């Protein structure tokens, strides 16, 4: 109900209170008590300040300020995330008397090596620089009983996983591990069976992944949307495409305009009956047409691999919806495109979602490589 329900020390509660947090979110409800126990955690949740707090709060509770050694290591893939994370740490740990330091591949080694001679309780860094400082023995991790990976999937790829294992070699054998990700697939199974011990799993996201899907956006005014869409329809080697709209009416209007444009398509939305929707879905699945126009529809069925281009005619408001539209269920990727039409008012949600899902939505280039959505 409240953060005091977790039996946190006064200063930590003060920090949380000053940050404006009154009611703990689901990720915090799940991760905070378990982490304080000492049990390992493997969590899937969309990125946020509240999630970062979901691991930072336990860290600040466990870390003893009287012990001037690195007691917690937070691994992040990017320097931006390192800065953000450390900001959260210093904010929430304002009254804790706890020191936090960022070390990344960007900053110079000399200054960080000098800084490590001072007291550092919590270390936030990127794999390369951290392994470097650890190998040079500048960073003593003999009492680092807490290990945390945010955006862990970005650091468990073929090359980074080795570095992570090397870094793990420095920590004490009995150490707690908190792993966080926004995408379910993880490359190595032995890594987790070896390094995670009876972990507590948290799954707060829909079982979908944006793996393999190349995502672009395009700054487009409403009046220009149809124009841009048709241009795409001629530019792209579409096999099958699904177009998403934010309301039933817009679905029908867009479908009509598409049909009049000299293109074949179906349409499905929430106002129809389940039978009609199943009919449209089954018909489209058999490749009867090339294009389908949907509103947001719950209970999505079975993945259609023919669909190699998905277009958000209307950009959604939440990451849940974006993932429900674009994401696939396969643990392996899917070679396909996701194209988002961004108006002015959509711009913020373009940023937010991109941050929340830990993905990349770049600006649509002049010409799109065919190797990205066309299979052989």
């Amino acid at each position: 109900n409240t953060f005091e329900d977790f039996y946190l020390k006064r200063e930590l509660l003060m920090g949380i209170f000053e940050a404006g947090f009154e009611k703990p979110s689901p990720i915090q409800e799940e991760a905070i008590p378990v982490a304080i126990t000492g049990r390992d955690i493997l969590a899937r949740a969309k990125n946020g300040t509240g999630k970062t707090a979901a691991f930072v709060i336990p860290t600040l509770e466990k870390v003893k300020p009287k012990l001037n050694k690195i007691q917690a290591l937070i691994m992040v893939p990017t320097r931006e995330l390192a800065l953000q994370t450390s900001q959260v740490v210093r904010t929430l740990g304002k009254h804790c008397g706890i020191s936090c330091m960022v070390t990344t591949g960007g900053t110079n080694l000399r200054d960080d090596i000098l800084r490590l001679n001072e007291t550092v309780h919590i270390l936030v860094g990127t794999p390369g620089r951290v392994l470097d400082l650890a190998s040079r023995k500048v960073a003593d991790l003999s009492d680092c009983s807490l290990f945390i990976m945010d955006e862990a999937d970005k650091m468990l790829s073929r090359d980074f996983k080795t570095i992570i294992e090397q870094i793990l070699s420095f920590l004490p054998p009995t150490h707690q591990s908190l792993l966080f990700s926004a995408t379910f697939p993880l490359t190595v199974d032995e890594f987790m069976d070896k390094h995670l011990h009876k972990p507590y799993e948290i799954n707060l996201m829909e079982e979908l992944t944006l793996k393999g899907i190349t995502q672009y956006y395009a700054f487009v005014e409403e009046r220009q949307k149809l124009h841009c869409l048709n241009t795409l329809f001629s530019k792209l080697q579409i096999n099958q495409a699904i177009i998403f709209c934010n309301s039933t009416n817009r679905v029908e209007l867009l479908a009509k305009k598409i049909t009049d444009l000299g293109y074949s398509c179906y349409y499905s939305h929430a106002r129809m009956k389940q039978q009609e929707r199943n009919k449209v879905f089954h018909e489209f699945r058999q490749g009867k047409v090339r294009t389908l126009v949907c509103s947001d529809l719950l209970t999505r069925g079975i993945d259609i691999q023919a669909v190699n281009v998905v277009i958000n005619f209307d950009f959604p408001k939440t990451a849940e919806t974006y993932l429900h539209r674009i994401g696939r269920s396969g643990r392996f990727g899917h070679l396909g495109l996701a194209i988002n039409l961004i108006n002015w008012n959509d711009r913020f949600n373009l940023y937010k979602i991109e941050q929340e899902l830990g993905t990349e939505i770049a600006a649509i280039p002049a010409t799109i490589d065919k190797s990205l959505y066309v299979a052989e």
Binding site: A218, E221, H227, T231, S247, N249, L253, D314
Partner: peptide
């Protein structure tokens, strides 16, 4: 065209998108 359902929030600007003056082609520049 056909819409004519109980309108919802994002329908408020459909006239901008599906207006008679709305340009169509393959011209669009990125």
């Amino acid at each position: 065209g056909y819409g004519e359902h109980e309108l919802e929030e994002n329908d408020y600007l459909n006239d901008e998108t599906f207006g008679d003056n709305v340009q169509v082609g393959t011209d669009f520049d990125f």
